[PDB]
């Protein structure tokens, strides 16, 4: 009966040990802007589910400041990884078969557990924020639209961008926006 609005937010620009892979100052500004935008949409968000990676945790802290009273939830399922071998293959980055073997199962589990039509027990349209990472979100988008998942690398997502998926109670999926950063000043938009 309900429709689910899924807002996938990519972590802001960060420093490239994971613990020391924290947001850059520009990343802080980007997350600040994203929080401003989310707060200005006038929506009552149900949850902020976020990856357990440092940069996702920090982007979540900043965004959560603008959405007081929104439940926060941590997940290992949403951590960044290598979902499937991309086609066409990209040569600078080429993970080992083990990374596909592990991360594909984990990220596919994430897609199946979080991307679905509302449960029949659901009362009203939901508005949910998912703060995670580039590869994860791109794979989620390919899977949700039932496009070949090997094409996740055909997408590109700016830091702090908002990707809006809509799942109607009949299971149909609409991608209403991908990589939205129009709310950021152009000089502060990054992909890395």
């Amino acid at each position: 009966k309900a429709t689910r609005h899924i807002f996938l937010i990519r972590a802001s620009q960060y420093h490239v040990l994971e613990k020391d892979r924290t947001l850059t100052p520009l990343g802080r500004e980007q997350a600040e802007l994203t929080g401003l935008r989310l707060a200005s949409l006038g929506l009552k968000f149900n949850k902020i589910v976020h990856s357990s990676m440092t940069r996702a945790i920090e982007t979540t802290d900043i965004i959560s400041r603008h959405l007081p009273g929104v439940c926060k939830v941590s997940t290992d399922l949403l951590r960044e990884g290598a979902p499937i071998e991309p086609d066409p293959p990209v040569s600078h980055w080429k993970p080992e078969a083990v990374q596909y073997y592990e991360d594909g199962a984990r990220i596919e589990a994430a897609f199946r557990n979080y991307i679905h039509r509302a449960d029949a027990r659901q009362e009203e349209d939901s508005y949910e924020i998912f703060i995670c990472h580039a590869n994860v979100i791109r794979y989620i988008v390919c899977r949700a639209l039932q496009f070949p998942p090997e094409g996740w690398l055909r997408l590109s997502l700016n830091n702090g961008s908002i990707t809006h998926l809509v799942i109607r109670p009949n299971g149909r999926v609409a991608l209403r926006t991908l990589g939205d950063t129009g709310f950021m000043p152009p000089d502060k938009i990054t992909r890395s």
């Binding site: 080992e96 078969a97 083990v98 073997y101």
Partner: peptide, 11 residues
């Protein structure tokens, strides 16, 4: 019932 030596992708 043949054992796969690369079940974990680490050979």
């Amino acid at each position: 019932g043949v054992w796969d030596p690369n079940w974990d992708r680490r050979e």
